[PDB]
Design a protein around this nucleic acid. Sequence first.
RNA 1: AUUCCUGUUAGAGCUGUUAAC
DNA 2: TAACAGCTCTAACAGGAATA
RNA 3: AUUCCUGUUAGAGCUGUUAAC
DNA 4: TAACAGCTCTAACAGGAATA
Lengths: 576, 576, 99, 456
Amino acid sequence: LTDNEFYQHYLQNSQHMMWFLGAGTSRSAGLPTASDIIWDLKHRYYCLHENQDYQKHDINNHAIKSKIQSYMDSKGFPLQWSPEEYSFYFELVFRDDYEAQRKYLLEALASRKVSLNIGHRVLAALLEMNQTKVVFTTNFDDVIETAFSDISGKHLSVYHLEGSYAALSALNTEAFPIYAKIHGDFRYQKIKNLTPDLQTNDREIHKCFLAAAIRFGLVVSGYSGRDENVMTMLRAAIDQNNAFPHGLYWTVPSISKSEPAVQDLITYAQGKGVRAYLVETGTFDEMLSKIWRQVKDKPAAIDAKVRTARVCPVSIPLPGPGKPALRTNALPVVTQSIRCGVVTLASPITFSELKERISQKSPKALLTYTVLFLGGEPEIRKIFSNDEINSIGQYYIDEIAQSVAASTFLKSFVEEAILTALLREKPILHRVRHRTHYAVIPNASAKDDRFLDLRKAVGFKGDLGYITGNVTNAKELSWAEAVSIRLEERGGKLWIMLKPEIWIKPLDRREEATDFIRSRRRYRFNQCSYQILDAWIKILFGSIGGGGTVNISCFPDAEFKAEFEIGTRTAFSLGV
Amino acid sequence: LTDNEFYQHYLQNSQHMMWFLGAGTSRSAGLPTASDIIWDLKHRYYCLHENQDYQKHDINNHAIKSKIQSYMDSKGFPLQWSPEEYSFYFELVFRDDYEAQRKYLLEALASRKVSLNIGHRVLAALLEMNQTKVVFTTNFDDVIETAFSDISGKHLSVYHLEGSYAALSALNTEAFPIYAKIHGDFRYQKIKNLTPDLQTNDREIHKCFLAAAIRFGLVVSGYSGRDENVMTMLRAAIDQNNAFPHGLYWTVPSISKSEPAVQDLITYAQGKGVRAYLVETGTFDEMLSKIWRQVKDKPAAIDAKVRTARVCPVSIPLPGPGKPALRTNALPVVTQSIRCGVVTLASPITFSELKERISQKSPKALLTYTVLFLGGEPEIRKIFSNDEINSIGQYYIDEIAQSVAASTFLKSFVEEAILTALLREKPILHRVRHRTHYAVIPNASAKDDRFLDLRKAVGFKGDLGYITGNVTNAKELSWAEAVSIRLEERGGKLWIMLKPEIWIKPLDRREEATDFIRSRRRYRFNQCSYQILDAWIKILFGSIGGGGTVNISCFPDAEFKAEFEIGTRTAFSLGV
Amino acid sequence: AFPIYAKIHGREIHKCFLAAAIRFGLVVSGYSGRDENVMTMLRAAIDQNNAFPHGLYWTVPSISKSEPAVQDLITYAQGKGVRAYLVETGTFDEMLSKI
Amino acid sequence: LSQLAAHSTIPEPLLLFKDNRTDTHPLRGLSQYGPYSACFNLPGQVRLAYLAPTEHMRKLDAIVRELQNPATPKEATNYYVEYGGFEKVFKVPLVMPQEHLRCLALDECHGVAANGNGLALADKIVQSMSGLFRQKHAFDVLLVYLPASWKKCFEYDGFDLHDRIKAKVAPLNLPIQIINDTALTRQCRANVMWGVSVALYAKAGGIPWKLADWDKDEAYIGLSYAIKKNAEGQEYTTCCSQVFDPDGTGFEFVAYDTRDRKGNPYLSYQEMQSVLSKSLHLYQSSHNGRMPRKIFIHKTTHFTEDEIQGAFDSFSSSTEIELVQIIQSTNWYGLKVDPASYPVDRGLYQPLTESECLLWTQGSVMGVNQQNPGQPVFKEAALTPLPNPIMLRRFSGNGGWHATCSSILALTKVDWNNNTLYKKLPVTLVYSQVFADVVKQTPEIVNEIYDYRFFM
RNA sequence: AUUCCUGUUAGAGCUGUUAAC
DNA sequence: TAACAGCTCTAACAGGAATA
RNA sequence: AUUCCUGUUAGAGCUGUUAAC
DNA sequence: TAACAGCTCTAACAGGAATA
Ligand SMILES: [Mg+2]
């Protein structure tokens, strides 16, 4: 059974689903696994008799692990990761002292090293929002239970073997959500973790689980068999006529590495008439997030704790401009709402198709798709005939900043509109390089008075500079002053970015003048750049950057006209 | 022992403090008390033997309660609120069926009617933030298992009679916080609630009470005795070296109504050398509220759940002004930061003292205490000699709105400053009534051209009106048009409030012209009031309310001058 | 307010020792008993319901060389239900170094 | 509306030197006081070795002699300080190799270079090292020279000789200072001498200088990637570097892989959690188990939801995490006014949006001018006329722009491989990028972690 | 590759917005 | 999955040297 | 008090800000 | 606890009648 099918199956019927999590989920919560736990005991055992400093060797070192394992093999102990080893080393270290064994197992799996991860904060959410009712976890850790306390703020009813009859009663009275530990909490005398204790099953829990099986279908994850008592309980549990209406999916992280016991149990279950399926869903943590992703109408209150990254942190406010102040190149566009034109097409259209129609027709208007057009209707009639046009109406953009941030098409459209507006009534030529727009001094009109201030900006030692011309050592390359103008969405504001550049008349032959572009820009220091930016502000706006609110409209003689207003003074902020 | 000394005593040493919550605290959690349970049982049984509709008659009715109690007394049952009644009615209704008894007690005290209040949440916060480590409460339903889990976000280890030896191990290994129920959860069969079960104590739990006695001191609340087993455990508990190291205060909501067993018990402890004290601190909720109030450096994360009212809800944002629009009387003061003068006094001063110095000296400046003065230094030198003045420096109010909102002295000072500024260069007279400032047309200069528009405002059917004069039937009362001008702090903004009024020249003789004030104001409808407000805006600002940002400074010829800027157009907002 | 150091000089610390006795298990080294005052001190500390919960451990350099009173007290504590033990280690300084 | 939030200029971070003296100018402090790690004897003496063809060994011995003797700065004299001689300035003798500590490259290297085979050329250069291998005890550092005739194999598609050599000799523990003719012939001499000498000291021993005012309880993490152009698609090889000041005096600067295949430079939940786990386990090993309290994860690209969730769930609640993204290319650029002759003071951070700030890692630096004291210096004056700031887009933090901005500024100055005053990016990002290049060239390096002195 | 990052020429990676399949 | 928009990065080259 | 809330004349109640005790 | 600032309320009176 494929993994996508498992997610669909767990979503169609998620209201009747027991979970079974034994020692596999604890790996990812920061809790040492049983394999790691064996090494911790071996480390203590070796350091104890052979008097060695505990600080001197770290157990996850390869050399120290090999040395300790060689020592263990020297005394005839089991060789490597073999059965009857974990219980063997426990009973060796603690020499049949179940109180000290319990205390150590509590300290190793204590509730201070546990850090819940998304897979854990998803199962508890499923418990609270009441899709899964029974979770049998063969883990003695205080997590999934801690996860429920964190996510909902309530107390979860955990059932250790210390009571051991509450689960049979609780499932029957439907006081969900139940979390019955088949091996019980470590806070109690009986832990049932050694191999001799792992051959028997508690009579009443056997019952709790059987009741759960008839009522729900089982999903077992992070479980690799190797336990005889749980395997025989599951085998008996299938014996029941309606064992899992919802089918049992054993989610292994890897089907290839799954033990043969799981596969033969699945085959036996299929032979007994149930629809048990084995699926490979990678890690439990990855799987839980996908199951949660497919969950519909998840409450916001619990989802604010399930996925803490979903909520937006670091909303740290900025201080006031009170009390040297950098002067950036950002002109704030205080326009909040604009009007655009919409055309309805009888057939669906593609933004590429509209772009090629722009290239062919070359109208005196702007258009984009989302089809929002800015300009005159007759231009659109030239672009689109009456047959393909259903209606032409109006569009209002109440929040320009949110609109451009949401859709990049709106960003490009508004950038093109403001660029056309700024260069509508001025002699400065408008070009494009890649996806950016450049306002460049024209070659012929370089002697204008409105450029003279710019001529002062580039001048050396206060004399008259040059604005346009030919490269010193180029055959045909022509150069001019220019400004790259862009639209930047910052927070909830829109700004115009101006950057002084040296435009080259041939587009593809810009690199041949690189040295010149370098040479002309070697000494454009803070004062010179300040002067050039002021001159460009004056050219583009017509007013000096003091207390100005110049307003510019694109296509003023058109029915659909956009009227922007940009402060003539660039952004500044005095130091604190 | 007075309650305040007990609070200091606890606050002095709350690190080492066991709590002993009885069934009284759960009284508020919304769970039915012992008497409520008894009345439910009688009503449940009375309706069945005598076939009566269960929902037809309620239980908290006085008549139905009396009728049911009379029926119960008819069959020879115990009379009224007497011992061996609660257990008697339980054993009568359930005829020795402990499973059904447990199920009913679970349903009555279930975790759906419980709504945690401040007391349980505060105790759970004390548990999490680790001041109190052991909470033994003779209750049943998990009001705290829930509440500490909700505020801390971490699961709580509850101990009961099903295991009952977990508490001693957890105490010995310092696995705090521990919450040991001396009578166990209702999910578990051991409930220990009938009188025959209430004579014995579990050996391991009883053992725990004595070991925990030496480690901490006990605070017992919501407990009224009447239990033999807990009383004898405490007496045994009292009978040990340093049984309560910090002492045990048996807190009761009322010392007068306390049972003699407690007072007998408190007197008994004192004879055994411990410092046990009985105090009255009101209800459990108020006690814990005060205890949390005295808690220092409480973490913000848990306190956001302890007191949900402390955080500010209902921060519902307001929409835009998009798309009839009311025109209020509020002029927005866009000034954000102002400069003031500060004088340092060699001796402490009182705001009343400064006010009387103002009354006597009558300087040409403003002063307030927080001493912030606005005006010229020589005026302050007239008010205060060199001997009492240490230094004179500057003060900056970066956020005017927050400053006026925080301190009402700042509100009054800024209101007076803006009033003086607005009437600095204008012939309109400035008066005060109560604490409201009035700008009134002067008597002599009533023929000014700047008043002619106002003359148009009051005119009838477009003719020339009257602005100042004498009352129709008053001996000496003189009347004039005026505007009450005030400062209003709204959110993060400051506004100027203008209200048209009819000023009367004698302050205390205003009522004699009331009819006239009524008669003149009978027909000042929306159009007329609009005209008067526009005329007053023109008079006070010199510019019509379109796109204006008139700026006014008070004491422009002074070293310490306040320069405010108020938009000339009142607040407006188009309908959505 | 730990850490605490108190010298018996053998009832001022007797109440404190009994209070200490319930809180944590005690280990006694470098002492052979032979003093009736501390003997009764410890015997009185044993009686309570939860006395020396972790255990009472007697560490002498040699088990057979210890005075009979120590073994008598160990047997009495074991009979009372406490988990007192008599373990043989080396010299107190060597024991602490190995710890 | 044109008045932005008030900025504050973080002052020039102080650098811990010889006898715990602090000076914000690295080279001036090195001349005046000496290396920070020279307080203890980590390098007893800097014993060198040469690996070059027989023809060009004279260049190696000549440059070593130049390191021995003092030199004066010719270019960029605004910043640089006169060399005082290796023995005088680093307080440790620089030992010229003897005959047996001076190897000769095989003549087959020339044939391979003529054949234009980079892999075989790197293999032959490494195989030439066996003569030095026996006397591995004999030579602390090795100066590998490459003649210009090998240029055809220096850099071409799907290959880089320097990274291949570094990855081949990293598991063999011998530091290597590659010398090209490029810096063998460069006009200014004090430039090359300062750079080579500081590199030699760092690779033989370590810690020429250490950043002062460094809380021992913060571990700084930087993730950076590189691209291997596969025939069918692409491979995004991302690696993570870590810096921290441990309880011991030796400031630590390491890097490591992140593991299989990645099609995008964004780590998934499991990979981010695994990398972060390795990071704080390394910190705990270097801090006897103590948990870090502040964690800074600098990434060149934005953290997805999975990365932020992995960060949140890998640590406990006691360790607040400062997830910050660094943007190099930005549209904004500032100009200081009082307009100033020199650009805006270095280190000014300007809060633009509640989560996005401008940091001026480039800009004028005060107090480090040699000639005409008091004049500001612009490090990148030759390259650019104005400083281009970077954008910090905080993805997770509790509060305080200053806390992360000052940390980034101090992390921009501890690149011992960098000759100049500072770096545009924190050392975490630059070392993660260098190791990403190394791993992309040699994929069989994911097993081990390496100190900075191997790859700088 | 003693260094530094300034540009050029390209491609990807993410987001999106449509059309689907 | 196929285009299209923006934002940002690296991958190869080239390249000159700190306010003149 | 069939109603309505417009004013007048007063006092409190909360918040604060100081000085204390 | 004593003043002082504002915001808001009720407690007693009085009082005239729906754009003229
Ligand atoms: Mg190097």
